[PDB]
Amino acid sequence: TTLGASIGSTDFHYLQKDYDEIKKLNLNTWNEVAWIGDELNSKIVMWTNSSPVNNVTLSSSDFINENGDLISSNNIKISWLKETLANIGRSNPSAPLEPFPDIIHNSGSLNIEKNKIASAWINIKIPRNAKPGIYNGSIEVTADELEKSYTFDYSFEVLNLVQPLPSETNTQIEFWQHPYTIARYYKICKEDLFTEKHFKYLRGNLKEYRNMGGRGVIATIVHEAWNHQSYDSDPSMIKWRKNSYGTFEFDYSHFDKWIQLNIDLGILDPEKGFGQIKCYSIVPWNNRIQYFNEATNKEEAINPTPGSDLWINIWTQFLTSFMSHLEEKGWFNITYISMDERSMDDLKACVDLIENITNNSYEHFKISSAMDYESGNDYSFLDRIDDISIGLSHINHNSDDMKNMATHRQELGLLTTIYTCTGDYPSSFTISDPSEGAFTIWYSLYQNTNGFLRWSWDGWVENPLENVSYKYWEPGDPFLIYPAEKDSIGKTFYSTPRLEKLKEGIRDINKAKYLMEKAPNLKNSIENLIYSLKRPNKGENAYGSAVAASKEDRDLTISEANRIKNGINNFAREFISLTMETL
Ligand SMILES: CC(=O)N[C@@H]1[C@@H](O)[C@@H](O)[C@@H](CO)O[C@H]1O
Numbered sequence: 001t002t003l004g005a006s007i008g009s010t011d012f013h014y015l016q017k018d019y020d021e022i023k024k025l026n027l028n029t030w031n032e033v034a035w036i037g038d039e040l041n042s043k044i045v046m047w048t049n050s051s052p053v054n055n056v057t058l059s060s061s062d063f064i065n066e067n068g069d070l071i072s073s074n075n076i077k078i079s080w081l082k083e084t085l086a087n088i089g090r091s092n093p094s095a096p097l098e099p100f101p102d103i104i105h106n107s108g109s110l111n112i113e114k115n116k117i118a119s120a121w122i123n124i125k126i127p128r129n130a131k132p133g134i135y136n137g138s139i140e141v142t143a144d145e146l147e148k149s150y151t152f153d154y155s156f157e158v159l160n161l162v163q164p165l166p167s168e169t170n171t172q173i174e175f176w177q178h179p180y181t182i183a184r185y186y187k188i189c190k191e192d193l194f195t196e197k198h199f200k201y202l203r204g205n206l207k208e209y210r211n212m213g214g215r216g217v218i219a220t221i222v223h224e225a226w227n228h229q230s231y232d233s234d235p236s237m238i239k240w241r242k243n244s245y246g247t248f249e250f251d252y253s254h255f256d257k258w259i260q261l262n263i264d265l266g267i268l269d270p271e272k273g274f275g276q277i278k279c280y281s282i283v284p285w286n287n288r289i290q291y292f293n294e295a296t297n298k299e300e301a302i303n304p305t306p307g308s309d310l311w312i313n314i315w316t317q318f319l320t321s322f323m324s325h326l327e328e329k330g331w332f333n334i335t336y337i338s339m340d341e342r343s344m345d346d347l348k349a350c351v352d353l354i355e356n357i358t359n360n361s362y363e364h365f366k367i368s369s370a371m372d373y374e375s376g377n378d379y380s381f382l383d384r385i386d387d388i389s390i391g392l393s394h395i396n397h398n399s400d401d402m403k404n405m406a407t408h409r410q411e412l413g414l415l416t417t418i419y420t421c422t423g424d425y426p427s428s429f430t431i432s433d434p435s436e437g438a439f440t441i442w443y444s445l446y447q448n449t450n451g452f453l454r455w456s457w458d459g460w461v462e463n464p465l466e467n468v469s470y471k472y473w474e475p476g477d478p479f480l481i482y483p484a485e486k487d488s489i490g491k492t493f494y495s496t497p498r499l500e501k502l503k504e505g506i507r508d509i510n511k512a513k514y515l516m517e518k519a520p521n522l523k524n525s526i527e528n529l530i531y532s533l534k535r536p537n538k539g540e541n542a543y544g545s546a547v548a549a550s551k552e553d554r555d556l557t558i559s560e561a562n563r564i565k566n567g568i569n570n571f572a573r574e575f576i577s578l579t580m581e582t583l
């Protein structure tokens with residue numbers, strides 16, 4: 001027929017190459033369980049045969065429970081998934097380019113060419129004052145060349161528990177933002193950086209970050225701190241210069257505007273100690289510091305070795321000046337100096353220096369680092385670092401070491417996350433199954449950490465809406481949101497199924513934590529459910545990208561995330577029911 005349609009999973013992509021199998025789909029009903037103030041996602045997958053089909057549109061009804069309580073269609077947004085091209089390899093110019101439905105794009109009508117797949121993402125926001133019950137409604141697909149519209153029957157159960165607000169949880173989330181990348185893409189000239197004209201293209205995506213639980217805000221403190229690994233250079237938010245007396249001076253202009261923005265948006269709250277400023281880095285690439293030398297009127301650069309007299313000298317100047325500046329602003333207590341996975345001799349020199357430099361309340365800078373930890377219960381150096389993030393590929397699954405390490409840090413009130421990056425599986429690539437994201441968040445809880453860190457909020461390539469390929473890494477690795485179109489009026493970014501799955505994991509671990517606290521009879525049962533989590537094996541495709549080790553491993557990833565979720569909602573249910581029977 002002209003247009004086929006079926007409900008599909010949000011957990012994996014429906015790709016053009018799978019057209020003939022996709023056409024056999026025939027799911028006409030959907031159901032899910034939600035808390036008050038939760039969100040659900042779904043998907044409709046469609047296909048054409050030999051004719052193009054025009055003006056394809058989806059509309060939701062209102063949803064109504066058994067008492068007539070209403071959740072308006074206002075709370076349902078239906079968005080076309082847009083495809084972009086991705087080189088399917090890693091550092092491999094000859095890998096093929098294939099299309100991936102990675103972009104949650106716009107609402108409205110689509111014209112679909114012949115012999116194509118197209119899917120639409122469905123987002124359902126449950127109001128924070130919604131009534132419990134089973135809600136029913138429908139989603140209707142029409143098109144010009146379609147005689148009989150499709151009606152898909154949707155229901156969900158709202159449980160009588162309230163989804164926690166981010167600020168009511170102890171989940172740590174940190175995604176690295178690249179505000180000069182947003183400037184580049186949207187044609188913000190040098191003169192307008194960190195002016196209102198730049199802020200208009202930042203605010204939307206930062207609120208997005210905030211609302212899902214983002215707490216870490218990165219800021220660069222030297223020039224090109226990652227040696228231009230990304231498509232866009234990384235400028236320093238603190239400009240360095242050397243004066244005629246041979247000592248250094250620091251312009252905090254961009255730094256201050258950046259942090260203030262994040263304070264204004266409610267991401268950081270320095271007075272109450274909410275959120276973090278992560279200052280990258282005291283061990284930037286090759287220890288290289290580029291600075292304007294006033295005596296010679298040109299740019300110079302030096303590479304002092306950590307723990308040398310010269311390194312100690314320069315970095316004492318920076319840290320004492322920075323600490324004063326921060327104290328004047330009232331920002332010091334939420335500021336962390338970031339290291340990185342360097343020689344342990346270099347990290348020791350960093351921690352030694354930092355602990356030497358105190359303010360007049362006897363406090364030194366907090367310290368943050370990605371750390372290569374795999375075993376052993378010697379926590380003597382790790383305990384000196386306030387926030388650490390351990391990469392997934394360094395975590396040995398058949399072992400309690402990570403969990404033991406993290407539990408120690410939890411007892412000391414220190415922070416711990418896991419991160420993913422290039423080479424990881426599960427991960428958060430364009431080519432990934434989006435459900436890898438929910439698995440990733442569950443795994444952060446399995447390891448008894450506070451949550452999840454990723455380097456990659458927005459590190460866009462030239463035109464990611466059309467091709468995400470970059471010279472390094474699996475495709476889509478550097479960004480979890482897309483920009484909007486360069487000429488956009490209105491939208492400033494687009495979400496991704498992979499991001500929405502992280503969001504899902506974050507909401508569902510927050511449920512598990514809420515119940516563990518409010519239901520002491522169930523806490524240990526809940527812990528055991530989480531401890532049953534299995535971790536899949538990984539391999540590589542032919543082009544160097546990390547992928548599941550087998551179909552069984554790939555199915556595990558999806559079946560595990562959903563199993564824990566459903567188990568948590570059953571605990572939620574038994575808890576509600578027993579509270580009622582026993583009230
Ligand atoms: C609202 C907010 O950000 N709260 C955090 C809390 O969740 C926890 O992480 C704690 C660390 O000791 O700091 C708090 O101020």
Ligand SMILES: CC(=O)N[C@@H]1[C@@H](O)[C@@H](O)[C@@H](CO)O[C@H]1O
Pocket residue numbers: 226229370389419420421422454455473477
């Ligand atoms: C904490 C972290 O993400 N570190 C690096 C990051 O800088 C970047 O190189 C990324 C590329 O995927 O790999 C990560 O290992």
